[PDB]
Structures are given as C-alpha cells and as structure tokens.
Design a protein around this ligand. Structure first.
Ligand SMILES: [Zn+2]
Ligand SMILES: [Zn+2]
Ligand SMILES: [Zn+2]
Ligand SMILES: [Zn+2]
Lengths: 121, 119, 119, 122
C-alpha cells in the first residue's frame, strides 16, 4: 500500500490518448503521472502544421501539473497507439527532470528507470 | 456575446499557478470553447529557455484534455491583469485551434486571428 | 533597392541541403542583412516533431554566426520555388532581428513585418 | 594519435564563436564547436527571443550550420559558457545531437568526454 501502481498510469495514459491531436504523424501519444500528493495528471501530444510548434504529451502533462496547483512529479508512464511504453524525447527529459528531480521514476521499454539515469549531468 | 470580463477574471485566477522563476513574468490565459466551456493555461518555464511553454501552450493542452473543440475567444493577462498580445508562436497555435474567426483581447482591444496572423 | 530574384534563387539553391525526412517538405530561405550580405537557412526536422528547426531559424543562426546585424529583406521558398509564408514562430524571430520595417516576399507580394505580425 | 579529436581546438573555436552570441534575456552567452565526419569545424551561438521558448540553443545553431555546409555526421562537440568552461547540452539539444551524430558522438562535459549513448540512453 503506497507503491506506484504502474498499471493505473498505463490505463490512464491509454484513456487520455483518446484526445491526442496528432493528424500530421498519425502517431497519438498519451501520458499519465503521479504528483507527490498522490494525484493523477495526464497529457496528450498536440501537433502543429509547423512541426516545431508541436507539444509532446509530457509538455501537456507539465501544463496540467501547474493548472492543478503544482507540486512534484513522482512517477510517469508515456504510451503509444498500442499502449506500449514510450521513452521520452530529450526535450521532455529536461521538462521531466525540472519538475521531478533525479528520483522521478519513468516507465521505459526496459522497465522502470530514474531521471538520474535518463538524463545524467 | 463573449463575456470578456469573465475571461480576464479567469485568466488572472489561473495566473496564480504560473511557473516563471526565470523571467518572474507570470502569465495566465483563459478561453471559451465553441461549446461554452472555459479553459485556462499558465506559462511554465525551464532552465533551458527554448523549452519554456507559453500560457497559450498550456491552454491548448487543456483544450484537448477536456475533449477538444474550437477556441472562440481568448484573453491573456500579465502580472497586473492587463491584456497581453500573443507571441508569433502562440498565434500559430491559436490559428490552428480556432481559425481566422477566433477573437483575442489585445492591449488595444479585440482582434480576430485573421488580423493577428495574416495569411 | 532589393533584388528579389537573387533571394529566390539563393533560397532555392540553399534548399538542396534541407533535412526534412519527416514531412518530405523541404524549405529554403534567403535574406539580406543591413550591410548587404546574403545569408540562407534550411529546415532541419527531428524524430521528435516539436524539435524541428524552421528554415528561418537556421538563417537567424547564420545571421549571428556571421557577425550580427538587422535583417532587411527575406524570401522563403517551398519545394517548387514558390514563396512560402513564415509560420507564426518565425514571424516572431524575424521581428526580433529585423523589426517592423523588415520586408518579406509573400504569395501576395512584398509585406512588412508590421503587417505580418501586428503589435 | 594523428586523427584523434583535438579538444583544445574545439574549445578555442567555441570561445571565439561565443562573441556573436545573442543572449540579452539571460545574459548567459554560449558558443559551441563541432568536428564533422569529413573533418570540418562548425560552430553555433545561442539566440534568445522575447518569447523565452523561441530561444535557439548554441547546439541548434550548429546543427543548422551542419546542413548549411552540406550535411554529414557530427563526430565531436564542445559547448562553452561565458568563462569558457565546458557546458552540458540541455535535453532538447541531446536529442538534436543524437539525431545527427548517433550514440558514438563525443561530447566534452565538466567531467570529461562522454558519448551520446551515455548522455541520452535509449
Ligand atoms: Zn518529448
Ligand atoms: Zn507565446
Ligand atoms: Zn517557421
Ligand atoms: Zn539546448
């Protein structure tokens, strides 16, 4: 009781994906996270006709973090169109690190890793 | 039939949750969606400046979280509660999610997206 | 004066080095700096879409690499060599480095930044 | 030994390029310099914007130079701050570098040379 339920994150990222705006890649992504108060926040990717103005699902999740009063990320699970875990892109790694620190857990294809190991400095 | 005052009040309230430690320039934004619901966003900076998210980026994220639709009016405010013009990046996002008819409060009054980003 | 044919050829020429494997939509841009020198840029996309650099972003980098200055005229082209409008984000970059009196070729003719990004 | 990366050359080149840096919003100027797989030296400076999130990192500028001069693959990169000390690429830039140099790209870091495989595990 109190351990991260990666399954809850997975299923929440999957459901969030329903709303993905990715008509340029046709590659919908969902993400879900636990904040340090135990609440669940989600994001989706949002693409633009100009490719460099697209927002990663994780970006939207960071926006949801602050919309709902802030805090710190503790656990994050990004999913593709099949529900499989996705590795965050380097940009999202930096956003994740800033709002999670080195101890943030990320679900990856090779299991749970920390931001300490995904973004060494 | 936009209650522009409800938008400014909403954007000011949203603004409390702003993450701008680097600039100390917090921003909030509120918008109406074509079904009438009110969404808001706040800016979220990053130690790497080019990673920062405008408040309108957040509102767009919130647009989709809450099931999509088209933006119909938007109001961005500064730490004093005064209208802010969206930057060029944010103009392209709003064009994309509201089209040319979307209305935006500006320092000099209401302007459509057609006027703010001519094509 | 400004020679617009020289920029459109220089842009097209530059477009050859485009890195656009994701959109298959290569872009070139050419512009004059206030000291008469000609600079170009191409788009460079990325597996993570939102990390793509626009042609105009590349040119802006070329501007500073080559010693600074203000942009005076700019011509962006698509794969056919036709004038392309800068995206809203690039308008904000152009404005920062050319100001309101910077001229851009558009499908409809020369327009200034002041027109294309009202403040 | 002949053909090893000369990190001195990269560091001096990055200090030099840093003089054209446009950083009025942070007052944190950055220069970067790279060897391409044909041996040519490229550079980049950061370019800030009134909208913070439209800022270009030094590594972005260098990537644009890579293509402007004919493409190729990055082989070694040295980023510098205002004191000429080694600087770590932010996350977005590690993603650009990865895409144009792959896992075996060498980056100089405060703790010595590291590869992109080490800096951005996949
Ligand atoms: Zn990402
Ligand atoms: Zn903006
Ligand atoms: Zn652009
Ligand atoms: Zn960077």
């Amino acid at each position: 009781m109190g351990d991260v339920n990666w399954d809850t994150l997975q299923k929440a990222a999957v459901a969030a994906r329903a709303n993905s705006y990715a008509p340029y890649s046709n590659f919908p992504v969902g993400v879900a996270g636990f904040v340090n108060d135990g609440r669940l926040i989600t994001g989706v990717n949002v693409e633009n006709a100009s490719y460099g103005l697209a927002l990663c699902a994780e970006c939207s999740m960071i926006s949801a973090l602050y919309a709902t009063g802030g805090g710190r990320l503790v656990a994050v699970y990004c999913v593709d169109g099949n529900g499989d875990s996705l590795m965050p892109c380097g940009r999202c790694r930096q956003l994740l690190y800033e709002h999670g620190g080195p101890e943030l857990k990320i679900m990856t294809p090779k299991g749970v890793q920390t931001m300490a190991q995904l973004l060494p400095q």
